[PDB]
A and B are shown apart, each in its own frame.
With several copies, the nearest count.
Chain A
Amino acid sequence: HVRSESSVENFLSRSACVYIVEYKTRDDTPDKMYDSWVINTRQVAQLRRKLEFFTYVRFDVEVTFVITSVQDDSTRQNTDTPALTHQIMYVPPGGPIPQAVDDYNWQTSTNPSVFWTEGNAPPRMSIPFMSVGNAYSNFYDGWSHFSQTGVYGFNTLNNMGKLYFRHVNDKTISPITSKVRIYFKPKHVKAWVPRPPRLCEYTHKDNVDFEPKGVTTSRTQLTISNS
């Protein structure tokens, strides 16, 4: 008789790896030296269901990045590379977008960045509630702009931003790939108008579409008997 762990915040405010970001430090294809992530809550199926218990949600965000590096094999594993610096730039809704590792949009002012050297504690940056409306929508029964044009159930209004990742240093002499892991912990959660859990599996991350599943697991009889 406690009911302190059935709270909304003791149910949703837990960290979870949501995406893995792979990028290198020396290539020839000029887009494998960086990677990005458009921030949403629809990639981990667990957290997607736990947020689809409710229609409107409203939370802060605390992201912790776990950054690890492993060198690719070559002729020249015998090297002395100094410690690597990574950049994690945040693009708010309405910000410019880089198109290479040497693009000017890595240098712009109103895109907050974090510079981390190898060996330290993992980085961390908080992201506030940055919607125009009062709460995010998990569900949206309508069109975004000019109905019967545009995708059904979009809700332009609830975008949170996106991240970009590159190695700050120059091109090294051996290829070293770095994979980061993103721990997305929502904070100060308030939820409204609850709704039943999903029964069917998921098919895409941008719509509610499904194949019809059953209702439960079927029995053999209707009346029970002894062992």
Chain B
Amino acid sequence: ENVNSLEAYRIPVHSVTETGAQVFGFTLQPGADTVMERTLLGEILNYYANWSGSIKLTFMYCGSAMATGKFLLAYSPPGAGVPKNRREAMLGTHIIWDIGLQSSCVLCVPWISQTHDAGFITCWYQTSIVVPAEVQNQSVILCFVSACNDFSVRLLRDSPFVRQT
């Protein structure tokens, strides 16, 4: 029921009384997953049966200029499961992204394919979001995605989204 709105893009993040909880997470399949299904990159990639290459993610924090905090952007490689802890995600491949000095972190994910379970991208709290007085607590992250320059496709087909009347 959030899909039929503009709230479908806004990722809610606020102050949490725990510290190792999870903010978001999605399977890393550009075209099969329902998350980046109707994304422009998913739309170029639904016209082909074979595709390979890389993928960039970008995460932008749209809160105030006074808030600060840290996140843990873990990348579970394909074959590996989804971690259930901040600590289990910490021993994997992660990056600590400080809000108070970098409003955008870019995460170029290595080799991904569907015919050349592909991975996971999870986001864990590290610290709470520290806020001064008279500044609102609720804030927002927005994602961005595009390919890199090494992206190839091999066999054209009909798209699974246009249905004939």
- A contacts B directly (C-beta below 8 A): yes
B153 contacts chain A at the CB level, 8 A cutoff: yes
Chain A facing B: main interface SS: loop
Closest to A46 in B: B162
B164 x A92 contact (CB < 8 A): no
A1-35 vs B: 1/0 string, CB under 8 Å?
11101100011001000000000000000000000
Beta-carbon contacts under 8 Å, B1-53 to A: 1-4, 8, 11, 22-27, 34-35, 37-38, 40, 43-44, 47-50
A225 contacts chain B at the CB level, 8 A cutoff: yes
Q: How far is the CB of B43 from chain A (nearest CB, A)?
A: 5
B157 x A1 contact (CB < 8 A): no
B25 x A94 contact (CB < 8 A): no
Tell me which residues across on chain B come within 8 A of A10, comparing CB atoms: 156
Given contacts A216-B34, A218-B1, A224-B122, contact A96 B158 (CB under 8 A): yes
Tell me which residues across on chain B come within 8 A of A217, comparing CB atoms: 3, 34, 37
Tell me which residues across on chain A come within 8 A of B162, comparing CB atoms: 45-46, 49
A86-106 vs B: 1/0 string, CB under 8 Å?
000001111110000000110
Given contacts A5-B153, A217-B37, contact A96 B160 (CB under 8 A): yes
Query: Could you show 26 A-B contacts with beta carbons less than 8 Å apart?
Result: A1-B152, A2-B154, A5-B153, A11-B47, A11-B156, A49-B162, A92-B155, A93-B155, A94-B49, A94-B50, A95-B158, A96-B157, A104-B163, A109-B158, A110-B47, A110-B156, A110-B157, A110-B158, A215-B3, A216-B3, A216-B34, A219-B35, A224-B26, A224-B120, A225-B82, A227-B81
Residues of B within 8 A of A (CB): 1-4, 8, 11, 22-27, 34-35, 37-38, 40, 43-44, 47-50, 81-82, 84, 113, 115-116, 120, 122, 150-160, 162-165
